[PDB]
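Progress note, project year one: complex with NDP.
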Amino acid sequence: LQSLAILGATGSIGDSTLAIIRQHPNRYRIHALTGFSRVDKLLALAMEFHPVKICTSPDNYAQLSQKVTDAGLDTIILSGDEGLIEIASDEAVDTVVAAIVGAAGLSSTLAAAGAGKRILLANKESLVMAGDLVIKTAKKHGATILPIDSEHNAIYQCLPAAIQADNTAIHHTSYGIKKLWLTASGGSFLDKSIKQMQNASVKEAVNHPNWSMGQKISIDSATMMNKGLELIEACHLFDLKEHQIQVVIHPNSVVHSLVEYVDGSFLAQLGTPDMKTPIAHALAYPERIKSGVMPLDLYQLGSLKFLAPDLDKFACLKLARYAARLGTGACIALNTANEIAVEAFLAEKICLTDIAVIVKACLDDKTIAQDYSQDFGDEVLGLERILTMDKKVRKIATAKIKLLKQGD
Amino acid sequence: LQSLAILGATGSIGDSTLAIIRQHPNRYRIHALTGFSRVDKLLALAMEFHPVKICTSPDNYAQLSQKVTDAGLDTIILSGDEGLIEIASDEAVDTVVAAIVGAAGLSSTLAAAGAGKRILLANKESLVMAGDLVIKTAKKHGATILPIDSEHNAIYQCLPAAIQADNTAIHHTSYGIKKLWLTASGGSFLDKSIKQMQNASVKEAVNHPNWSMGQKISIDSATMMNKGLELIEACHLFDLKEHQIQVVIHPNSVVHSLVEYVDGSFLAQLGTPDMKTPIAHALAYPERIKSGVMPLDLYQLGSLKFLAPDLDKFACLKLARYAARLGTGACIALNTANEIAVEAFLAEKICLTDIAVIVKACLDDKTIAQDYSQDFGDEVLGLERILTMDKKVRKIATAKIKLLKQGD
Ligand SMILES: NC(=O)C1=CN([C@@H]2O[C@H](COP(=O)(O)OP(=O)(O)OC[C@H]3O[C@@H](n4cnc5c(N)ncnc54)[C@H](OP(=O)(O)O)[C@@H]3O)[C@@H](O)[C@H]2O)C=CC1
Ligand SMILES: NC(=O)C1=CN([C@@H]2O[C@H](COP(=O)(O)OP(=O)(O)OC[C@H]3O[C@@H](n4cnc5c(N)ncnc54)[C@H](OP(=O)(O)O)[C@@H]3O)[C@@H](O)[C@H]2O)C=CC1
Ligand SMILES: O=CN(O)CCCP(=O)(O)O
Ligand SMILES: O=CN(O)CCCP(=O)(O)O
Ligand SMILES: [Mg+2]
Ligand SMILES: [Mg+2]
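Model obtained:
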């Protein structure tokens, strides 16, 4: 039985993954499950699946160990990055589902790559932060990356077999891949003024017309930073530069992305917007399996809309492409500044529209710019340099926010 | 150089094929080209490409041989089925593009199958008439069939590698194919009353909003018999029964068909409606090549509409599925009665809406029904039995038309 370790098991992507597993018992073994703050949920999950290991936050280590023994479970409890890395590199784990949010997922994804694991990547921030190093390390050590991100899974499904195996084949012109097309819902402020976007409450920003997701990706969807990060993710996943990857607004969230070929064929994946489809595809690959989604009814669709991105209004997407052109240092600055600004938005400290301001200022910061030319792709010193650069951006983005609330 | 024989070179599909060839001269050799009534066009094509053989109609044999020698060309002239069969089975021919319209294309397609050729099938009537025999014969003799028909080429592009090679693999549930979805423009009378459909002139029926095609497929598009024939073609091509193949109206002619998988993924081919895309894909397979189409601009699409087929209004599609369920005898009756009724419509003898009447009456005819149980799939006597049954249907459909213009 394919052995599974699920990182970020307590969150949104955690839920859909687990929902597939419950439809397919005796196909997968659950070896490990991780959470951070939701101890009780993690416990509940441990009692249900009886995993060999689980990992929680350092502040919940003791408490969770006590509850686990009180429940009479044989399960090992771990904590912090330490435990994630152990689980990600664990010898008895066949497949790792990387669904931790944000930079926090970086070390363990990198560890699964280092251990030659089959990796199901939801955690898009870890490739924005360290794409060169992640991919290099995977190839070096024989790890496989299947994308879980909906768009990237669509693109992956719509690419030839040879290129799924080896992303570099995309540059052989026989295959005739011309460009990739990323679809974006345009989030909940697509048909709203800039005025209403400033005034947005958190409830308005966090809720999405078509998708039910984690908090952060919800805010990113509203600002369109999500597509920005997806732009960089696609770059590393399919070994392209930003010029080969374009973006179309599509509010229905039915078409999930396209690959354009030289003969004029656009191969696309369509589906009801539900992460169980991409997750199910990646779990069973090369096979397929029922996912438990309510399949798309083509008779009841109506009009699928398409539209050019309004880049004044969704400057995050502008900035993301700008950063993609500058390389990894600027992609770290993009991502981390974004994490800090989103935290500030959710904490009712800035306006939704200030997220773009903060992120520009950090991209255009001289102190940050100085780091834009290091070897973040170095297999021995690269990690240390990404984590250091991350700390610096957190410091400056925070300062930037303080400054903005008065004047610069 | 891949050697090419083009059957139906003077027609619509002929034009697009040839237009690709002119963009790729150092890639294919033109070995043979065929036409029927357009002698001068065929001659013009012979002077341009200098083919080894050409074939025309029996009544133009002499005339065309005279003009060919007067032009100083070394090209052999052939005529009738005789010549088509010679060309289709010619030892120096690598690939055959079957783009003759109607049952007329049957013997030569069957001959290319019998000779183990790579075959690019536009000619959908020959598989409606003799699908069992064609496919059996191809597999027996090692012929390859790539679909040129737009919908089938879309479906083919959206299917896994293993199944492209071997259509039978589709029944292995690992691949998780659930059903196929055929898109239909709904022709030029989609948003018009039944009254206006009766009164339709030939000019109204023959012209199509999105496609420029031969006369017959144009009338079939207007009545939706085209999708009916496409339904049966898909059945034999991808080895399914009609229940696994469904139909959606899509007036924009951008999405050209879909394959639905068990996880909820719909893989689809999108493109501007232009047969150079499917033709180019089939010619270069497994590679790809520029086709000379103006590629789809996603920014300028607007609304892609989808809708259930109105089956009272497009009874041909009802009748086609009915025939598909009854098997080959009834598919011959469907197709041939359709040929005869379309000729009658174009000759200003029946109303557009009478095409469905005629075709039902022939499907429900006792004299025809008696033949619905023969072995039209027999490798030694099957052909004779299809051609005989064809002659009978032509006779009865004609009578049916005479009767209808007075009363039954
Ligand atoms: N539909 C979706 O939700 C989609 C999500 N993604 C991506 O998948 C990833 C997960 O997103 P999503 O599930 O929405 O987010 P959630 O906020 O719902 O889930 C986050 C998960 O990671 C854990 N986590 C949070 N902070 C830390 C930390 N500092 N250290 C270790 N673990 C932590 C959480 O634990 P706890 O909650 O127990 O504190 C939870 O298990 C993201 O990278 C997102 O961009 C991609 C496409 C679609
Ligand atoms: N876009 C399109 O046009 C599409 C076409 N198809 C299919 O492709 C095939 C060709 O259609 P299309 O190109 O539109 O039709 P056309 O009417 O343009 O062309 C028909 C071709 O076959 C020849 N032909 C006609 N009658 C006979 C006969 N009795 N014996 C031998 N040859 C004959 C014609 O020669 P001549 O003209 O010199 O008489 C011509 O070369 C059809 O099977 C159609 O269903 C499928 C999808 C799209
Ligand atoms: O993979 C799924 N998502 O990233 C959710 C997409 C929301 P968006 O279209 O507004 O980026
Ligand atoms: O392959 C191309 N065609 O069959 C032309 C399609 C016209 P329709 O959608 O009305 O059948
Ligand atoms: Mg996504
Ligand atoms: Mg067609």
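Residues A 8-14, 35-38, 99-101, 104, 122-125, 149-150, 211, 213-215, 217, 275 surround NDP (ligand 1) (CB under 6 Å).
Chain B has three domains: 1-149, 150-310, 311-408.
No further modelling is planned for this target in the current period.
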